[PDB]
Design a protein around this ligand. Structure first.
Ligand SMILES: Nc1ncnc2c1ncn2[C@@H]1O[C@H](COP(=O)(O)OP(=O)(O)NP(=O)(O)O)[C@@H](O)[C@H]1O
Ligand SMILES: Nc1ncnc2c1ncn2[C@@H]1O[C@H](COP(=O)(O)OP(=O)(O)NP(=O)(O)O)[C@@H](O)[C@H]1O
Ligand SMILES: Nc1ncnc2c1ncn2[C@@H]1O[C@H](COP(=O)(O)OP(=O)(O)NP(=O)(O)O)[C@@H](O)[C@H]1O
Ligand SMILES: [Mg+2]
Ligand SMILES: [Mg+2]
Ligand SMILES: [Mg+2]
Lengths: 761, 312
């Protein structure tokens, strides 16, 4: 089996599907099909055909024959590619045009920017010389290019007869009647689509199967005897993808789309907001199938505790009544968008309303890369821009932030060219304008000068850490496999033996021994999402979103199953219940303790969700967290031993320029009782010393050359500046253990007597 | 899919029976008198001109089966069971406020007969601080005083029994032990040699245990272990067996794939029963959750718990 969640997105290869390719002819009403492809299509040489494009756009052209066109090719020209909205490499479908429909009229009008420089009737110069007796097929809404000399005027197919498409026979009596098709109309063409949304595939698949399927193929649901949900609610960080995704789905499904912007509704006088809502719903019902996208729904339907006026609760109630009135099932779907899912009134998040919710969260590396590719598809990038590096460096960047980053890169490119650009002149040199290109350094500078927005939001992603990055801890990994991986990859195994596992683990040990890394590594092994939460972050949550922060992170973990919810730095929240119970500063630790235990109680029934903790202070750890049904498994992470420290050094320096004479194993003997953090700080000090050394070396070399320029560039060239043993010796000189010999036997004692904390002392 | 009404109080008869609980014969015998008789036979007490008490407190080492006894006695009497934990009560005040404890008690009244169990009294029933103060503990003080107030009005409802459970009898507020409240005191001891065999059997009553595993043998070696430790031993053993049979199946499939001509021999996946080796390995890492110094103290409290309403 496989994960069939992302199955609707898959394109089903068919004999009628041909890949896009360049044509041998620039004819706009004629393409060229390979003879074999035509035979599969039952077509013949020079036969009109309908090409199915993207965004519900299609054109009509006569297919020729040529053996150079490989089987998975169609050989269309640039104009057809633009009309279909398909770039090279897309997979269009081909259908026949048996009804050639020799048209009596083919209304043709020009575009203003393609007419600049025409001093004669366009009908007698462009249209008639190429259409009369040519029998060129024409598809309404497609821009065919024409030439009548030096100027090239492109006309849109305004109004054919038949209306859809026809063939331009000699009987087509028509001329150019005015210029009403100015180029600015392109703002509503090629606007949005599936290809314009990147970084979301699971959410996009969910939206498509909840919106497009009920509206295009309701027969499936009717036969299965299930009524599909009518309420969808997109939510996520501001600027992520919501309004784009809604419009993309609406345009791709080809259903009547009505946008109800919250500010627009609330900016009108009382009695017009409700009137507009009623009109929108009525029009959607009349023109079914339909979609009603309510952007910024939080403004028109905020939490009832926050809304003050009566003409706001009235609008909320009107919206609720209208949604309740949609149970007629007139192929109408109401989709929402709100960055504040909790700010929404609870009534909306109920059956018969917005009951199905999709979280358009922060994208991962591949998503950011795809977003950047989408946004830079039009910019004049140079041949040395590496978007992979930028995507790796852009952590916490939503799509809007990436678009702003591209814009800032372009601006920085302009600033570099400001020296050769004079602002006083009302016009800029054409050659200078066309020679501006965005380089990688511009992007790096823009990224340095740009800041992320969704850097505080919880991130649900598979960590990149593997077992290799962690040195030693073989037994800990061996037991973690049993505790986590087996009940996830093989859940039925436990049911076979009639015994359920435990969904809780606690890591206790000296600081810097690799407790945070183990959680990430085990998540990576099981390919399960990882949610990182720190005690300091939890403590500020109560002074803020309050009760709905811990509940929210746990709900997110539930929605993201399988998951590994890690609570680092339990030394603060899990502080043992004070004997003199009191205070509000610790009344937040008591909250993050009791409310957290309450959620732990309800989490054992979810399955495939494991709650892992980490504490450097097992003495103060609340004994309640150790209860069965909670973090009861206790795993001790010891200080690395002689063998483990070699692995730790190697991992810390797995990508370092270390010299050939450095004995990694030698340091292990001298560094005993040092945590992994100290072992990494040793390497950091060594790297800093090497940087100092090679900085001084390069400075001395350049100063030697400048102290008599006649001195030529000798064979001496900048070297690796590898980390010599001297640097490691100097680092070990200042290196100091972060765990004392008196603070290790105590950890051993707690390893012995930790779970006994639920009783007396 | 995720549930929605998973935080709401559930008023249902638990599925736990006396069989799931090992040992504790005397505790069950006295619980019958304390609970079942005044419910099934209410007129009996009126016949003798003496009313019973609607309060019980379970105090003992953790993992000895205090939560299970309440559910079992509810199941025996076919009475509804309402489970409330101290951590849940503490967050109620920062929320619905006064109308959470009142609401659970009203629900218990409406659901009579009922067994209102307050697990984890170690937090709400924290002894009234000598230096009374603070708002973090001002929630424990609330869930204490407001709870006692409801207990006072609950003795007239009849067929409603309030049971508590505390692993820290030292800090238990002396007010909860007053007559008209949780005044009956029942001590749940650590299981003895005979009880541990029953606990193992119950934990493994639906397990594939092999024919050579001596359940009684483990009982001798595991002394001072709570029932939770006895169940974690079985959990470790099951995990080891899962590892063993996972590796066995992987090796078998890899053997077949390392030359597909090798046919499917008579060897087929077996029960993968829990062999004695798994139990030995589990006992290797098994560690008591109750120390020998933290059992004599429970005995001392069994002796001198109800004397907490006076001085120290
Ligand atoms: N996944 C994406 N792929 C491509 N462009 C994107 C993507 N996400 C965002 N953008 C770009 O960034 C813009 C901002 O996103 P938008 O769709 O307005 O977000 P929003 O969630 O509706 N914002 P708000 O209502 O202010 O919280 C879009 O209009 C695109 O130009
Ligand atoms: N076993 C290890 N192998 C390799 N690097 C390690 C190891 N342990 C610690 N480190 C390094 O030291 C850093 C700190 O350790 P970390 O994994 O954050 O432990 P922690 O328990 O979260 N520490 P603290 O929050 O300070 O108590 C890691 O991110 C690594 O760079
Ligand atoms: N007498 C017993 N017989 C069988 N299983 C038992 C017994 N005592 C404890 N257990 C097992 O151990 C688990 C924990 O015991 P439980 O009945 O929750 O005691 P508790 O007093 O609520 N513990 P705690 O809240 O940790 O102080 C039970 O759910 C059973 O799985
Ligand atoms: Mg929006
Ligand atoms: Mg930690
Ligand atoms: Mg209890």
């Amino acid at each position: 089996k496989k994960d069939f969640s992302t199955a609707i997105l898959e394109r089903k290869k068919s004999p009628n599907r041909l890949v896009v390719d360049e044509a041998i002819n620039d004819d706009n009403s004629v393409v060229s099909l390979h003879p074999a492809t035509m035979e599969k299509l039952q077509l013949f040489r020079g036969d009109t055909i309908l090409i199915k494009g993207k965004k519900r756009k299609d054109t009509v052209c006569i297919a020729l024959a040529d053996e150079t066109c490989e089987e998975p090719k169609i050989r269309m020209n640039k104009v057809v590619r633009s009309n279909l909205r398909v770039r090279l490499g897309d997979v269009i479908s081909v259908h026949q045009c048996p009804d050639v429909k020799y048209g009596k009229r083919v209304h043709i009008l020009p575009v203003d920017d393609t007419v600049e420089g025409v001093t004669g009737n366009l009908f007698d110069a462009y249209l008639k010389p190429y259409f009369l007796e040519a029998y060129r097929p024409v598809r309404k809404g497609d821009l065919f290019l024409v030439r009548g000399g030096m100027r090239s005027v492109e006309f849109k197919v305004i109004e054919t007869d038949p209306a859809e498409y026809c063939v331009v026979a000699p009987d087509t009596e028509i001329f150019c009647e005015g210029e009403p098709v100015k180029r600015e109309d392109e703002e509503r063409l090629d606007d949005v689509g599936y290809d314009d949304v990147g970084g979301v595939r699971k959410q996009m698949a969910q939206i498509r199967e909840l919106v497009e399927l009920p509206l295009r193929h309701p027969q499936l649901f009717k036969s299965i005897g299930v009524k599909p949900p009518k309420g969808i609610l997109l939510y996520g960080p501001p600027g992520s993808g919501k309004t784009l995704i809604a419009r993309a789905v609406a345009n791709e499904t080809g259903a009547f789309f009505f946008c109800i912007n919250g500010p627009e509704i609330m900016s009108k006088l009382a009695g017009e907001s409700e009137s507009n809502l009623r009109k929108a719903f009525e029009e959607a019902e009349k023109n079914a199938p339909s979609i009603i996208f309510i952007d910024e729904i939080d403004s028109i339907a905020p939490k009832r505790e926050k809304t003050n006026g009566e003409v706001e609760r009235r609008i909320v109630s009107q919206l609720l009544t209208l949604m309740d009135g949609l149970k007629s099932r007139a192929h109408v779907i109401v989709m929402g968008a709100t960055n504040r899912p909790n700010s929404i009134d609870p009534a909306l998040r109920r059956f018969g309303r917005f009951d199905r919710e999709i979280d358009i969260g922060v994208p991962d590396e591949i998503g950011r890369l795809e977003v950047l590719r989408i946004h830079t598809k039009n910019m004049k990038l140079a041949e040395d821009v590496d978007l992979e590096r930028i995507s790796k460096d852009t952590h916490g960047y939503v799509g809007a932030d990436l678009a702003a980053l591209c814009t800032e890169a372009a601006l920085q490119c302009i600033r570099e060219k400001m020296d050769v650009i004079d602002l006083e002149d009302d016009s800029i040199d054409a050659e200078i304008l066309n020679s501006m290109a965005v380089t990688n350094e511009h992007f790096h500078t823009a990224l340095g000068n740009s800041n992320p927005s969704a850097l505080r939001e919880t991130v649900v992603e598979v960590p990149n850490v593997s077992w290799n990055d962690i040195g030693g801890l073989e037994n800990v990994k061996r037991e973690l496999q049993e505790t986590v991986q087996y009940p996830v990859e093989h859940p039925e195994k436990f049911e076979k033996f009639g015994m359920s596992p435990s969904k809780g683990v606690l890591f206790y040990g000296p600081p810097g021994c690799g407790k945070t890394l183990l959680a990430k590594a085990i998540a990576n092994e099981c390919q399960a999402n990882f949610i990182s939460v720190k005690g300091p972050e939890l403590l500020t949550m109560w002074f803020g979103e309050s009760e709905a922060n811990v509940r929210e992170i746990f709900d997110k973990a539930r929605q993201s199953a399988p998951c590994v919810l890690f609570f680092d730095e339990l030394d603060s929240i899990a502080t043992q219940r004070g004997g003199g119970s009191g205070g509000d500063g610790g009344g937040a630790a008591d909250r993050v303790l009791n409310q957290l235990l309450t959620e732990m109680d309800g989490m054992n029934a979810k399955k495939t969700v494991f709650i892992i903790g980490a504490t450097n202070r097992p003495d103060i750890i609340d004994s309640a967290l150790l209860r069965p049904g909670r973090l009861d498994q206790l795993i001790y992470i010891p200080l690395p031993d002689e063998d483990s420290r070699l692995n730790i050094f190697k991992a810390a320096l797995r990508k370092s320029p270390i010299a050939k004479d450095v004995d990694i194993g030698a340091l292990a003997k001298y560094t005993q009782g040092f945590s992994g953090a100290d072992i990494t700080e040793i390497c950091q000090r060594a790297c800093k010393y090497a940087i100092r050394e090679n900085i001084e070396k390069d400075i001395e070399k350049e100063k030697r050359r400048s102290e008599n320029p006649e001195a030529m560039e000798e064979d001496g060239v900048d070297e690796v500046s590898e980390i010599k043993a001297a640097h490691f010796e100097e680092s070990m000189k200042y290196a100091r253990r972060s765990v004392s010999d008196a603070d290790i036997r105590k950890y051993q004692a707690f390893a012995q007597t930790l779970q006994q904390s639920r009783g007396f002392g």
